[PDB]
């Protein structure tokens, strides 16, 4: 019950799943560096003591959380496609969602 | 503001009065008890304040209204040839009251087709209608000809201070709009200045039918706009 089969087995399924499809490589490494930007901003708020604008922090933070959200919501539609939604309609909706999130996060940075 | 209309064959008067009572002001303020007892004692002889106004209108007037700034007033009585008015508060000495009246006459007795050309009209407008005992410190008479009218000649019996020709867009004025011919008279008396303003203009049938054809142009370009937005392929 040491769960040694879990991380190795899911490591084989996921790590085999990456290089079989070249676009999921783009999606999950871009998700990973979005997590690095969230960690860099969060340790900027920890390293100093104040969050002085506090709309700049939630601007630069909710653009990374929201963009990670939209990337997972596209990866789930490319790995196993939804019934009424094509793979090309899986991507234009991501574009429109990402442009709306970029507008609201450039309005919220002031 | 008057509004000539060839499609409805009607002329539509609307007047905005800003009247003061320049009589003597009343000491000890105003008390409704002394006013109401003064009504209940006898007969309402001749006194200072304003309770009713008698508006002398043209002969056949149809749709009477009397509004303030804040809403309409229901205390008005439009009998034949005479439009009686009760304001909300009685206008004592020095008090202000700004109101608006309006009515609707047919156009067949204010407008006359000329003889040389069929599409040339001559209008004679009553310069002043109001209560019988009023003095007018400023009058601006705006007559509004329809959208394709072109004014040739202008005559007034009373010497005005100013005159100008502009345009103003009313309902369904898709093009430039109504022709606002506005006079500015300074000092007038209700009883004395008996006059009519004479406008000679033209209004050809080329511009008479451009109103339903202009609204037809907007409906047509809206529906061809619907056609472009339904023959267009957007399917990713
Ligand atoms: C109803 O109509 C009356 C009559 O035109 C309006 O009264 C006028 O109001 C203006 C601005 O309130 C007055 O101008 C003022 O002049 C004095 C000096 O005379 C100056 O101290 C003020 O700063 C201002 O410029 C004007 O005198 C006054 N006319 C009369 C005869 O009293 C009234 O405003 C209108 N009310 C509404 C609600 O539309
Ligand atoms: C005579 O009437 C004309 C209207 O054409 C007045 O001119 C306008 O005056 C206003 C000031 O309230 C300006 O905003 C407009 O731009 C003017 N328009 C034009 C075309 O000049 C003029 O002031 C009036 N003159 C007098 C002496 O009453």
Curated annotation (Swiss-Prot), chain A:
Membrane-related topology note: Multi-pass membrane protein
Pathway: Protein modification; protein glycosylation
Listed GO CC annotations: endoplasmic reticulum; endoplasmic reticulum membrane; oligosaccharyltransferase complex
Location, primary (coarse class): endoplasmic reticulum
Effect ascribed to mutating residue 60 to E: In OST2-1; ts; reduced activity
Stated family: Belongs to the DAD/OST2 family.
Effect after changing residue 93 to K: In OST2-6; ts; reduced activity
Described purpose of this protein according to its UniProt entry: Subunit of the oligosaccharyl transferase (OST) complex that catalyzes the initial transfer of a defined glycan (Glc(3)Man(9)GlcNAc(2) in eukaryotes) from the lipid carrier dolichol-pyrophosphate to an asparagine residue within an Asn-X-Ser/Thr consensus motif in nascent polypeptide chains, the first step in protein N-glycosylation. N-glycosylation occurs cotranslationally and the complex associates with the Sec61 complex at the channel-forming translocon complex that mediates protein translocation across the endoplasmic reticulum (ER). All subunits are required for a maximal enzyme activity.
Membrane-crossing residue ranges in chain numbering: 26-46, 52-72, 90-110
Keywords from the UniProt entry: Endoplasmic reticulum, Membrane, Transmembrane, Transmembrane helix
Effect noted on mutating residue 41 to R: In OST2-3; ts; reduced activity
Lineage: superkingdom: Eukaryota
Assembly description: Component of the oligosaccharyltransferase (OST) complex, which appears to exist in two assemblies comprising OST1, OST2, OST4, OST5, STT3, SWP1, WPB1, and either OST3 or OST6. OST assembly occurs through the formation of 3 subcomplexes. Subcomplex 1 contains OST1 and OST5, subcomplex 2 contains STT3, OST3, and OST4, and subcomplex 3 contains OST2, WBP1, and SWP1. Interacts with SEC61 and SSS1.
Residues exposed to the Lumenal side: 47-51
Record carries keyword Transmembrane helix: yes
Effect of mutating residue 5 to G: In OST2-3; ts; reduced activity
Cellular compartments annotated: Endoplasmic reticulum membrane
Protein name (Swiss-Prot/TrEMBL): Dolichyl-diphosphooligosaccharide--protein glycosyltransferase subunit OST2
GO biological process: protein N-linked glycosylation
Effect of residue 49 to C: In OST2-6; ts; reduced activity
Segments on the Cytoplasmic side according to the record's topology features: 73-89
Effect of residue 42 to S: In OST2-1; ts; reduced activity
Curated annotation (Swiss-Prot), chain B:
Glycosylation sites: 98, 162
Transmembrane segments: 212-232
Side Cytoplasmic, residues: 233-236
Subcellular location: Endoplasmic reticulum membrane
Additional observations: Present with 11900 molecules/cell in log phase SD medium.
Subunit text: Component of the oligosaccharyltransferase (OST) complex, which appears to exist in two assemblies comprising OST1, OST2, OST4, OST5, STT3, SWP1, WPB1, and either OST3 or OST6. OST assembly occurs through the formation of 3 subcomplexes. Subcomplex 1 contains OST1 and OST5, subcomplex 2 contains STT3, OST3, and OST4, and subcomplex 3 contains OST2, WBP1, and SWP1. Interacts with SEC61, SBH1 and SSS1.
Main function: Subunit of the oligosaccharyl transferase (OST) complex that catalyzes the initial transfer of a defined glycan (Glc(3)Man(9)GlcNAc(2) in eukaryotes) from the lipid carrier dolichol-pyrophosphate to an asparagine residue within an Asn-X-Ser/Thr consensus motif in nascent polypeptide chains, the first step in protein N-glycosylation. N-glycosylation occurs cotranslationally and the complex associates with the Sec61 complex at the channel-forming translocon complex that mediates protein translocation across the endoplasmic reticulum (ER). All subunits are required for a maximal enzyme activity.
Family from the record: Belongs to the OST1 family.
Name of the protein: Dolichyl-diphosphooligosaccharide--protein glycosyltransferase subunit 1
Organism: Saccharomyces cerevisiae (strain ATCC 204508 / S288c)
Gene: OST1
Parent sequence residues shown: 239 to 474 of 476
């Amino acid at each position: 019950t040491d769960f040694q089969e879990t991380f190795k087995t899911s490591k084989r399924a996921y790590f085999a799943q990456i290089e079989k499809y070249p676009k999921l490589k783009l999606i999950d490494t871009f998700c990973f560096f979005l997590v690095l930007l969230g960690v860099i901003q969060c340790t900027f708020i920890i390293l100093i003591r104040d969050n002085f604008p506090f709309n700049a922090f939630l601007a630069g933070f909710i653009i990374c959380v929201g963009q990670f959200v939209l990337l997972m919501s596209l990866r789930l539609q490319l790995c196993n496609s939804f019934p009424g939604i094509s793979k090309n309609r899986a991507f234009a909706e991501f574009i429109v969602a990402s442009l709306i999130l970029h507008f609201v996060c450039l309005h919220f940075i002031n | 503001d008057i509004w000539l209309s060839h499609w409805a064959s009607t002329i539509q008067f609307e007047e905005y009065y800003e009247l003061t009572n320049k009589a003597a002001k009343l000491s000890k303020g105003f008390s409704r008890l002394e006013l109401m007892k003064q009504i209940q004692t006898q007969n309402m002889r001749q006194t200072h304040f304003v309770t009713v106004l008698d508006m002398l209108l043209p002969e056949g007037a149809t749709d009477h209204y009397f509004t303030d700034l804040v809403g309409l007033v229901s205390t008005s009585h439009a009998e034949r040839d005479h439009f009686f008015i009760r304001p909300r508060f009685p206008i004592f000495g020095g008090w202000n009251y700004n109101f608006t009246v309006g009515w609707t006459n047919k156009l067949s007795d204010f407008l006359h087709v000329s003889s040389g050309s069929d599409e040339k009209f001559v209008a004679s407008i009553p310069i002043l209608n109001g209560p019988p005992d009023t003095v007018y410190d400023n009058v601006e008479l705006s007559v509004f000809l329809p959208e394709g009218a072109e004014i040739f000649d202008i005559d007034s019996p009373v010497p005005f201070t100013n005159v100008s020709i502009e345009t103003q867009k009313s309902y369904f004025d898709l093009n430039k709009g109504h022709v606002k011919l506005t006079f500015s008279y300074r000092n007038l008396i209700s009883q004395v200045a008996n006059g009519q303003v004479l406008i000679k203009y033209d209004y050809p049938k080329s511009s008479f039918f451009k109103k339903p054809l202009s609204i037809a142009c907007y409906i047509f370009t809206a529906l061809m706009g619907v056609f472009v937005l339904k023959t267009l392929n957007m399917n990713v």
